[PDB]
């Protein structure tokens, strides 16, 4: 499919940035997670980034560490996450769906088989958090064979060699985390997938700022999860607060 290509073309028509929330699948439970995700979409999310709970998320800070713990407390497994992904896609045919994965969960039952299941359930991209471009070949190849975009992080300490590699290897979008203008213009020069800024995006002004700097949009890596954490005792207030937040963040992409 071409879900990212179609989204960016549509956003470019409307002079609009993308806003992409992250949440952990199955946090704080499967049912509530499904409702959370439909609320994010209804409220204006342009795409989703979805985590699968993993025992040892060594690229994640405390907010997401705790989300994983909640999902494990609810007994959430990768198999259940894939059942969730199929249901999400069946409800929402055009929204790009990206996974944030740890390498062991991709490798566990075979790299090719993992990407084949992603294709079957309708996932569009996979970012493997602990696979640097240097180790990425079998992941990117399997992704592309199954019509999945492999997503790479361009970190704050990126050099030119890395920019060229990420530009060559990535698809869908570049996950942006040396001057910001430099990275963004260099990525465009090298024909990289459109850049989404993912560093500490927690307020509307940061969305506007990302677009102004020339990025195609912004990813909220943990702010959505923080709202879940804060509202655990009140499922209905949780949804209300998520709606208000996503609405505000999307409004800022204009």
């Amino acid at each position: 499919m071409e879900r990212y290509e179609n989204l960016f073309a549509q956003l470019n028509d409307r002079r609009e940035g993308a806003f992409v929330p992250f949440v952990t699948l199955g946090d704080p439970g499967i049912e509530q997670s499904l409702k959370i995700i439909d609320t994010l979409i209804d409220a204006g999310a342009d795409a989703l980034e979805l985590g699968v709970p993993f025992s040892d998320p060594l690229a994640d800070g405390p907010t997401i560490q705790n989300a994983n713990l909640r999902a494990f407390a609810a007994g959430v497994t990768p198999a259940q996450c894939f059942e969730m992904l199929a249901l999400i896609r069946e409800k929402h045919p055009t929204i790009p769906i990206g996974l944030l994965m740890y390498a062991n969960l991709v490798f566990n039952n075979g790299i090719d088989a993992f990407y084949a299941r992603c294709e079957q359930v309708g996932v569009d991209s996979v970012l493997v958090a602990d696979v640097p471009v240097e180790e990425s070949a079998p992941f990117r190849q399997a992704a592309l064979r199954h019509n999945i975009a492999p997503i790479f992080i361009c970190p704050p300490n990126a050099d030119d060699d890395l920019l060229r590699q990420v530009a060559s290897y990535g698809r869908g979008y570049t996950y942006l985390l040396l001057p910001l203008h430099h990275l963004i213009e260099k990525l465009k020069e090298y024909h990289a997938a459109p850049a989404l800024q993912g560093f500490g995006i927690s307020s509307p002004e940061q969305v506007s700022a990302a677009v102004r700097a020339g990025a195609a949009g912004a990813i909220s890596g943990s702010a959505i999860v923080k709202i879940i954490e804060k509202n655990l005792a009140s499922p209905k207030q949780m949804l209300a607060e998520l709606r208000s937040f996503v609405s505000a963040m999307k409004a800022a992409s204009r």
Binding site: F54, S55, D56, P57, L58, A59, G61, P62, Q65, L69, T77, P78, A79, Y102, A103, N104, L105, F107, N108, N109, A129, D130, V131, P132, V133, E134, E135, F152, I153, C154, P155, P156, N157, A158, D161, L162, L177
Partner: protein, 396 residues
């Protein structure tokens, strides 16, 4: 691009977030440079000799082999300053930290022995040391926590995940990814992302080099086999390395069998786990069927690393080294036997290596064999654990 091969056959690699790759490349370059630098080697040699106490004895055990055709030597890393082999490679890594202009050390620890070694090296060499330790481990290792603190290190309990060694490993990597301009990550075993398996081997290889010289002096020939416990793989690869090209010499690594392999309550991923990708490397893992990382179980606290170094996985795959397991009860018996018959109190980790040598002897008592066991540490730290077990049984 790296200077050195990050893999041992299919095992190893650099499976870290992209943000950490510059830290690994910097460390590899500093190591390669250090290995060609006579000044670095002389400073390392001086600390090993005059601070740590190398060379360590090779003790012939006078009583335990009586009535058999086994001759058994113990390489006495229990006599190194700090009471275990961990001290050797911390001194080398602390010097690499200084070579790179770092002023701070991060370390992970499970049983606390690597944490103590990191703390003592940091105190000697003027580095600010922080140690991550799973909260469950902190609770059960108050003596070591206190030593680390007496030596001026900050000990940070880790409450995420299982609150054990793996979780402490994650936290150390998280810290380093933000702090690597000023801090060095002093990884405690021959595992993790390249270049650590290589560095840790080269900074432990004096164990085997000395053993070779000592056994030649005393016996006029190489050993038939050298035997070492395997938690993450550092003391074993330190003993093995200099013998790898001596193809007649057996290399035997002993993983913890815990309550027995068939119970699943063990720590023997090399022979009984499944290859996965975690902690920066592709290696055999303790893991669930759906790929969640699990803990290693052993009576011994130090055989808790839930994977194994990739060079061991490689040496096994090609048949150069053989790996076996020893249960809690076998290790405990070997502990008691060495105390009573040789007057040496061995670490419970090391007791796993000794137990397998005793099995080699007892199973075939008329087989002529010259064995060396790496005695990776002393067992003072274990006497309460042993006491509690012997009382529970009713032996005391």
């Amino acid at each position: 691009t790296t200077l050195l091969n990050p893999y041992f056959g299919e095992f190893g690699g650099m499976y870290v977030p992209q943000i950490l790759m510059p830290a690994l490349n910097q460390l590899e370059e500093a190591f390669v440079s250090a290995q060609k630098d006579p000044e670095f080697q002389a400073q390392f040699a001086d600390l090993l000799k005059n601070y740590a106490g190398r060379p360590t004895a090779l003790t012939k055990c006078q009583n335990i082999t009586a009535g058999t055709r086994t001759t058994l030597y113990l390489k006495r890393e229990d006599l190194l300053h700090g009471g275990a082999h961990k001290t050797n490679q911390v001194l080398g890594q602390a010097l690499l930290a200084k070579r790179m202009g770092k002023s701070e050390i991060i370390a992970e620890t499970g049983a606390g022995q690597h944490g103590v070694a990191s703390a003592l090296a940091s105190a000697l060499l003027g580095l600010k040391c922080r140690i991550y330790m799973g909260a469950k481990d902190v609770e059960r290792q108050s003596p070591n926590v206190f030593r680390m603190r007496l030596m001026g290190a900050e000990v940070i309990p880790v409450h995420s995940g299982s609150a054990t060694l793996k979780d402490a490993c994650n936290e150390a990597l998280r810290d380093w990814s933000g702090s690597y301009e000023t801090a060095h990550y002093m990884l405690g075993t021959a595992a993790g992302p390249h270049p650590y398996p290589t560095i840790v081997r080269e900074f432990q290889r004096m164990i085997g080099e000395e053993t070779k010289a000592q056994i030649l002096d005393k016996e006029g020939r190489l050993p038939d086999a050298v035997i070492a416990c395997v938690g993450g793989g550092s003391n074993a690869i330190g003993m093995f390395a200099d013998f790898i090209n001596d193809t007649s010499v057996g290399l035997i690594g002993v993983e913890p069998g815990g309550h027995g392999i068939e119970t699943g309550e063990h720590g023997a991923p090399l022979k009984h786990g499944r290859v996965g990708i975690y902690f920066g490397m592709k290696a055999p893992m303790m893991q669930t069927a759906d790929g969640q990382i699990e803990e290693s179980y052993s009576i011994s606290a130090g055989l808790d690393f839930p994977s194994v170094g990739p060079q061991h996985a490689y040496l096994n795959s090609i048949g150069r080294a053989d790996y076996v397991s020893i249960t809690d009860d076998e290790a405990l018996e070997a502990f008691k036997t060495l105390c009573r018959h040789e007057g040496i109190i061995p670490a419970l980790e090391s007791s796993h290596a000794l137990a397998h040598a005793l099995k080699m002897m007892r199973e075939q008592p008329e087989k002529e064999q010259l064995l060396v066991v790496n005695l990776s540490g002393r067992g003072d730290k274990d006497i309460f654990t042993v006491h509690d077990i012997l009382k529970a049984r009713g032996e005391i």
